[PDB]
Design a protein around this nucleic acid. Structure first.
Ligand SMILES: [K+]
Ligand SMILES: [K+]
Ligand SMILES: [K+]
Ligand SMILES: [K+]
Ligand SMILES: [K+]
Ligand SMILES: [K+]
Ligand SMILES: [K+]
Ligand SMILES: [K+]
Ligand SMILES: [K+]
Ligand SMILES: [K+]
Ligand SMILES: [K+]
Ligand SMILES: [Mg+2]
Ligand SMILES: [Mg+2]
Ligand SMILES: [Mg+2]
Ligand SMILES: [Mg+2]
Ligand SMILES: [Mg+2]
Ligand SMILES: [Mg+2]
Ligand SMILES: [Mg+2]
Ligand SMILES: [Mg+2]
Ligand SMILES: [Mg+2]
Ligand SMILES: [Mg+2]
Ligand SMILES: [Mg+2]
Ligand SMILES: [Mg+2]
Ligand SMILES: [Mg+2]
Ligand SMILES: [Mg+2]
Ligand SMILES: [Mg+2]
Ligand SMILES: [Mg+2]
Ligand SMILES: [Mg+2]
Ligand SMILES: [Mg+2]
Ligand SMILES: [Mg+2]
Ligand SMILES: [Mg+2]
Ligand SMILES: [Mg+2]
Ligand SMILES: [Mg+2]
Ligand SMILES: [Mg+2]
Ligand SMILES: [Mg+2]
Ligand SMILES: [Mg+2]
Ligand SMILES: [Mg+2]
Ligand SMILES: [Mg+2]
Ligand SMILES: [Mg+2]
Ligand SMILES: [Mg+2]
Ligand SMILES: [Mg+2]
Ligand SMILES: [Mg+2]
Ligand SMILES: [Mg+2]
Ligand SMILES: [Mg+2]
Ligand SMILES: [Mg+2]
Ligand SMILES: [Mg+2]
Ligand SMILES: [Mg+2]
Ligand SMILES: [Mg+2]
Ligand SMILES: [Mg+2]
Ligand SMILES: [Mg+2]
Ligand SMILES: [Mg+2]
Ligand SMILES: [Mg+2]
Ligand SMILES: [Mg+2]
Ligand SMILES: [Mg+2]
Ligand SMILES: [Mg+2]
Ligand SMILES: [Mg+2]
Ligand SMILES: [Mg+2]
Ligand SMILES: [Mg+2]
Ligand SMILES: [Mg+2]
Ligand SMILES: [Mg+2]
Ligand SMILES: [Mg+2]
Ligand SMILES: [Mg+2]
Ligand SMILES: [Mg+2]
Ligand SMILES: [Mg+2]
Lengths: 33, 128, 160, 224
RNA sequence: CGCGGCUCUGAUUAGUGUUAAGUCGAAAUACGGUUCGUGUAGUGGAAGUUGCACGGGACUUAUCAAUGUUGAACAAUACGA
RNA sequence: AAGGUCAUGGCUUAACAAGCCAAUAAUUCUCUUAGUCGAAGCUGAAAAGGCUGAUCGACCACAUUGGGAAUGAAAAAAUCCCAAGGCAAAUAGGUACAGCAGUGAGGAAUCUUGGUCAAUGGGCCCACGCCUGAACUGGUAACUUGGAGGAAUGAGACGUCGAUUUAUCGAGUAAAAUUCUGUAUACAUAUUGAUAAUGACAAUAUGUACAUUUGUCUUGACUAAUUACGUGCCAGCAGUCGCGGCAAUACGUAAGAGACUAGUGUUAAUCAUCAUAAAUAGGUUUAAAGGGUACUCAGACGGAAAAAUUCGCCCAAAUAUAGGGGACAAUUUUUCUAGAGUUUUAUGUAAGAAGGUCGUACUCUAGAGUGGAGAGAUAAAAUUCUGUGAUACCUAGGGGACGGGUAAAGGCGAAGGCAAUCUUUUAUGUAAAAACUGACGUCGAAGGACGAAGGCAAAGGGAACAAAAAGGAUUAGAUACCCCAGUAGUCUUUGCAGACAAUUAUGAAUGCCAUAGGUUAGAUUUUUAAUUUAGUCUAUAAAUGAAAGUGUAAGCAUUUCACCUCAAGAGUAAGGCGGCAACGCAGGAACUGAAAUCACUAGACCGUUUCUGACACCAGCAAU
RNA sequence: AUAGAUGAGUUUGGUGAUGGCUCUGAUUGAACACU
């Protein structure tokens, strides 16, 4: 995979990693960790 | 793959391709009747331009789809029973169906001369 | 086993691709059976059992190989003379059909169909120049020698 | 494959096929090239086939998986061992110039080493001792050392006469009014003089560089 | 009657797809003007950015202070661009 | 051991024994979907082809749903008993059209409430005969198939019509007209379906008579077939690519042309196209795709020369009784030494681990040391350090990590990774000779083990470095890049964790294919230098590849495991498993697209290199 | 059963590949429109 295409996976993995940190609290309240 | 890998079931069916008109392909039906939930206009995508006459139809199966109205000028409106067939509007996203012109409530193009069978237009009978 | 025949087929391809006048093979009755059929079909020039060094080129037929006993059986090898005519090897391709992972057997009516250039089973029809060698109870034979004797058996390789 | 497709070995086959029929179907073929019938019965020779090369030395019998079977082997003779022995005992025998240029390749037709070291067509050299030694060591059954001493001593007595004749030949010539030019001892020294001077100029010009650059190393440019 | 499964719905809430004509930056592609990517742990409206180790899909893109020789005289009937 | 049985079998029983099957899911359970099969139907050139599971035949199940038994030679019932809801019934206890026709409903969509038991079949009957929505026949529908649906002549009506080089090109042998035929069909006669007799209805044959429709799609390219006008990115066309923005062969109309025709188009579906899940028969360096690692159970595959057995394999089938052939295959036996191993302290070596040290620098403390105002930082500064004496130069103690040269295309280990030193301790690997075992081998799902950095947990350590937090600058703004400082963390011990560009973007292993130049550890030699074994790298040949390149392999072959099947959504969701957590393993579908993707070629560009021209710049004079 | 194996449009500035999509062939217990 070229560096141009790896940067597409790089953003998709960072957005997801960023979403789980943000919703970790409400996922801990609903017992979904 | 090796003969052992094939014997254990490595060969599986290829992932399915979505049909052009899933509401009809799912049940093997050529057409379906439906009531018009809304009759409005859709805008094509980047290359083309204009106003495409579309209709939000609630099929007899329960699905709500968007059908394209072929021809110039139509007669249907809210609460209108129309027949739906396959085929999509290529430049319109979400419009994956067509309406039949000789359908129940939708009338055929009156001032049509060429390809009358495509628009449900009776012959003028001007000669007789 | 069949693995030795598969190594004998790929080795002869590499020896003919390299335009070698001589080539050695492990000394086994199975390799000798296929070599005798290749020589009988006219694809190779000579067959001689010898040591790790090739015999004298000129006196190849009159070569006197020593008896094979347990004291030298480990160093014996089959020396094959390769042919090249019209700037082209006579034994260009040796494609195996039956492999260690699967032994392909053909019937007499399938060989009769493959001999005239029609597919049958996992085999394909023979074209101009191609040959097919079958390992039968009457020895390693050519497909046209097998249908004449009316026998089937294990298919070894297709010689282009 | 950067190389190109050379079909030089098939010029006749290709040319004879192109001349078999006519491009204008329905007419007889024209006359072929003039070279087609010349080499009609002289086909090319086989090329690119790798044979088992001549074995100038016995191949290693203990080897079980020998490599380099299609590689030419080194040519070695029983005289190689003898030449190395002689020329190592007489290094200055290599200073005598020898002409390895062939005249007609027929030197070995008049060599009968049963007579002595002096043969026809070849000069008295370290090769004569090796050939004479080999003959004695094979025919008269002498050993390597015994045959060496014999042919070696015969070789010395001949060299002595060659050096004694130069001195005497020049001494008698002057007794009857014979004069000669410069000799190597004189010519060799004159060439050293002319070359020694070139070094003197270089040294004299090269030493001035160091003494000047050395004295100027210090920054004494203030001139206090 | 209880437990479990399944279907539908749910205030509230998340993600993603599509849509030329909006807005804020300029992260990537050249040494992209802080090398870019992998993993991991932080951080910032956003692209980004920081530590630590790692990869080249970046530096083989590499091109003389050894400065380059009177290596056997001259003359003859030898030699003769 | 006994009984039972034609016979066999825990089939049955008593007494003993603890077995038997399985270990890669035998066994059990949940969810989703489905009547099964056939050259039966459709389809491909073909594959143990694919799809369907109508009409035909075979099998299975069911008769509103659920729960049951008896009768009988045999449940093989639209039977019988029971409960429930629907309809009917109330003092009853029937009914369920998935029997035929028919109605309502649902649906894009599928027909007559006919005649006869004359024919074939079946039930009852001594016989005659009775019954048969089985069946045979009439009806409805272009749903499909097959057939008919008209042939020949037709020249100046010196007429018409449309274009237009107004005189050329077409409609056009077309029409009219003329000469024939009697096709579907109508009518009539006869025969026949049927014979012991019985004809509901119709078939066939013969004779006579009749000349009766056009419809539909397309026309830019794929794809056979053109102009004119209208419209002006509007209206619209569109299977794919596309068309339309005021001189559109692509839209609408007109005419022409190209086709099929009682059909023609469109929609939906299936096969084929599609080597597009490749058993036949694919692929994974750079495009989807090689597991982080290799020791290993199961499993697959794997030497030499003989023999026994199966009779696999072949003759060779018809699921072939009985035989033959002996190469190969399976189990087994005996020998062999080429693979794989053991011994003979190899050499060489940053694999690993334990217990101790060494050193350069740094850092802290002390000597009211010497010295006496700066120092450090940066492109430049500021924050900052310093008169409580800094920087600089020393002496004496303490502390923590780190590892200069050697050093190389070098080496070691399964990989991760491993570089100061001494002792201790550990498995492989390499060279040469002998000896020894005698196929003991390779790969390997799973399980288990190991696995960089960061991270979690606990107890230490803390010099230096440094996420975070914070300050000073720069900047349009500056989280940042830079700077003054600085906590986790890095280090030690014990666990957790398992994700990496864990890379050679290339799994492991085997056989094989031509050279050259280096280099690493040995061996042999006439140890100069050659020869050779095992590694590693460079550049090539044959060849291979989309090419870049590779050429100890990305070649020729083989074995085995893993993995891939258009993009995007997505390595995401849900349920589950592991973990203290962080996260890991496993892993979709919906919605939306016709493209995503790789290597190369020539340009242009670069706050890219090196050159070449120009008052381009420098310098000078003048000017705005 | 021995004649039976076929392509086309479409990614790029361009070229060669990779890889889907669509068309070309046959068909239906089909439906719809014009007849
Ligand atoms: K890839
Ligand atoms: K019915
Ligand atoms: K009857
Ligand atoms: K295009
Ligand atoms: K037999
Ligand atoms: K047998
Ligand atoms: K590494
Ligand atoms: K710091
Ligand atoms: K700051
Ligand atoms: K080498
Ligand atoms: K290849
Ligand atoms: Mg499109
Ligand atoms: Mg028209
Ligand atoms: Mg809601
Ligand atoms: Mg950046
Ligand atoms: Mg940038
Ligand atoms: Mg950058
Ligand atoms: Mg980074
Ligand atoms: Mg910060
Ligand atoms: Mg770069
Ligand atoms: Mg590069
Ligand atoms: Mg069902
Ligand atoms: Mg019912
Ligand atoms: Mg309805
Ligand atoms: Mg009867
Ligand atoms: Mg009777
Ligand atoms: Mg008639
Ligand atoms: Mg009767
Ligand atoms: Mg055309
Ligand atoms: Mg149209
Ligand atoms: Mg048009
Ligand atoms: Mg018809
Ligand atoms: Mg790997
Ligand atoms: Mg893993
Ligand atoms: Mg990985
Ligand atoms: Mg033995
Ligand atoms: Mg032995
Ligand atoms: Mg061994
Ligand atoms: Mg050692
Ligand atoms: Mg003081
Ligand atoms: Mg002080
Ligand atoms: Mg220390
Ligand atoms: Mg070092
Ligand atoms: Mg090693
Ligand atoms: Mg192994
Ligand atoms: Mg495993
Ligand atoms: Mg760690
Ligand atoms: Mg730690
Ligand atoms: Mg702690
Ligand atoms: Mg560590
Ligand atoms: Mg662990
Ligand atoms: Mg790593
Ligand atoms: Mg593996
Ligand atoms: Mg190395
Ligand atoms: Mg190379
Ligand atoms: Mg995807
Ligand atoms: Mg999701
Ligand atoms: Mg999950
Ligand atoms: Mg995963
Ligand atoms: Mg270029
Ligand atoms: Mg100027
Ligand atoms: Mg100036
Ligand atoms: Mg002015
Ligand atoms: Mg490009």
């Amino acid at each position: 995979i070229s560096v141009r295409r790896q940067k597409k996976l790089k953003i998709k993995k960072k957005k997801y990693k960023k979403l789980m940190r943000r919703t970790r609290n409400e996922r801990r309240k609903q017992d979904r960790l | 793959a090796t003969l052992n890998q094939v014997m254990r079931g490595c060969r599986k069916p290829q992932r399915a391709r979505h049909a052009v008109s899933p509401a009809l392909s799912s049940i093997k039906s050529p057409a379906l009747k439906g009531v018009c939930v809304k009759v409005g206009i859709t805008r094509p995508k980047k290359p083309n331009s204009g106003e495409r006459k579309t209709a939000r139809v609630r099929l007899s199966t329960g699905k709500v789809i968007t059908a394209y109205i072929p021809g110039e000028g139509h007669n249907i409106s809210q609460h209108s029973v129309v027949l739906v067939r396959g085929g999509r509007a290529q430049d319109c996203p979400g419009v994956r169906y067509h309406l039949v012109r000789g359908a129940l409530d939708l009338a055929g193009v009156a001032t049509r001369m060429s390809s009358r069978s495509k628009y449900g237009t009776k012959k003028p009978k001007k000669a007789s | 086993g069949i693995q030795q025949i598969t190594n004998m087929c790929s080795h002869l391809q590499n020896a003919s691709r390299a335009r070698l006048g001589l080539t050695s093979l492990p000394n086994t009755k199975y390799n000798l059976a296929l070599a005798l059929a290749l020589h009988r079909a006219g694809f190779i020039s000579s067959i001689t059992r010898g040591g790790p060094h090739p015999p004298t080129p000129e006196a190849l037929m009159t070569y006197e190989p020593e008896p094979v006993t347990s004291a030298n059986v480990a160093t014996r090898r089959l020396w094959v003379g390769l042919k090249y005519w019209n700037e082209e090897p006579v034994l260009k391709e040796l494609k195996p059909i039956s492999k260690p992972s699967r032994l392909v057997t053909a019937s007499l009516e399938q060989l009769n169909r493959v001999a005239r250039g029609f597919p049958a089973g996992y085999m394909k029809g023979l074209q101009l120049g191609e040959c097919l060698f079958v390992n039968t109870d009457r020895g390693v034979l050519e497909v046209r020698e097998a249908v004449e004797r009316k026998v089937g058996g294990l298919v070894l390789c297709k010689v282009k | 494959g950067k190389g190109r497709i050379f079909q030089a070995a098939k010029v006749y086959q290709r040319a004879s096929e192109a001349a078999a029929t006519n491009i204008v179907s329905g007419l007889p073929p024209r006359n072929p090239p003039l070279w087609l019938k010349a080499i009609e019965s002289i086909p090319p020779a086989e090329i690119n086939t790798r044979p088992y090369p001549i074995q100038h030395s016995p191949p290693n019998p203990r080897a079980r998986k020998p490599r380099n079977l299609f590689r030419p082997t080194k040519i070695v003779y029983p005289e190689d061992e003898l030449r190395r022995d002689f020329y190592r005992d007489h290094p200055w025998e290599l200073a005598r110039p020898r002409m390895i240029i062939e005249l007609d390749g027929k030197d070995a037709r008049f060599l009968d080493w049963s007579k002595g070291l002096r043969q026809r067509g070849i000069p008295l050299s370290g090769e004569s001792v090796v050939q004479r030694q080999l003959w004695l060591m094979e025919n008269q059954g002498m050993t390597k050392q015994e045959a060496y001493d014999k042919a070696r001593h015969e070789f010395y007595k001949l060299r002595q006469l060659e050096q004694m004749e130069r001195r005497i030949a020049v001494e008698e010539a002057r007794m009857v009014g014979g004069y000669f030019g410069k000799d190597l001892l004189t010519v060799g020294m004159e060439l050293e003089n002319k070359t020694y001077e070139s070094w003197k100029k270089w040294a004299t010009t090269e030493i001035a560089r160091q003494e000047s650059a050395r004295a100027s190393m210090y920054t004494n440019v203030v001139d206090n």
